[PDB]
C-alpha cells in the first residue's frame, strides 16, 4: 500500500477543536501542488514533514 | 475546492451586476486575500474555465 509524505505549512487556529487536536494545512511533498487540510494529535510547528496514509479526504471540525 | 466554488460565485455576481455595487469593498478584500494566500496551487493548476473566469472578473 502506498504511503505518502507532505509538509506542514501553516498552523490554523480559532476553530473549535478538541484539546490535543490541531488543524493544519499540508502541501504534498513529492507532488508540489495539492494542499489538504488535515489534523494532528501531537504538537506541530511550522514546516515539518509528515506521514500520510489516506489520500482523498480533507479533514474537518472534530467537535 | 471551496476556493474554486468561490471564484464561480464571483463570476455569477459579475453577471448580476446590481448586487456588486453595494458590496464592492467586501468583494475586493476577500477575493484578494483568498488568491494571495492560496496562490501557489491556484497558479500551478491548469483549467481554461478558470482562466476565462479570472479574465472576466478582472475586466
Amino acid at each position: 500500500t502506498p504511503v505518502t509524505l507532505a509538509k506542514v505549512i501553516k498552523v490554523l487556529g480559532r476553530t473549535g477543536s478538541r484539546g490535543g487536536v490541531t488543524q493544519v494545512r499540508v502541501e504534498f511533498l513529492e507532488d508540489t501542488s495539492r494542499t489538504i487540510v488535515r489534523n494532528v494529535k501531537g504538537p506541530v510547528r511550522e514546516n515539518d514533514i509528515l506521514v500520510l496514509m489516506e489520500s482523498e479526504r480533507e479533514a474537518r471540525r472534530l467537535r | 475546492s471551496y476556493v474554486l466554488k468561490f471564484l464561480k460565485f464571483i463570476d455569477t455576481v459579475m453577471q448580476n451586476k446590481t448586487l456588486l455595487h453595494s458590496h464592492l469593498p467586501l468583494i475586493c478584500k476577500n477575493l484578494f486575500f483568498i488568491i494571495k494566500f492560496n496562490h501557489k496551487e491556484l497558479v500551478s493548476q491548469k483549467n481554461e474555465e478558470l482562466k476565462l473566469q479570472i479574465n472576466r472578473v478582472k475586466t
Binding site: 480559532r14 476553530t15 473549535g16 474537518r60 471540525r61 | 471551496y2 466554488k5 468561490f6 464561480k8 460565485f9 455569477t12
Partner: peptide, 23 residues
Amino acid sequence: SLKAGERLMEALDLGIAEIEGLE
C-alpha cells in the same frame, strides 16, 4: 454551533450546487 469558515463553506456549497444545477 458552527464556526466561521464552516458556515460560509457549507452555505457556499449549497449555493454553488443550485447555480451549477441551473446552468
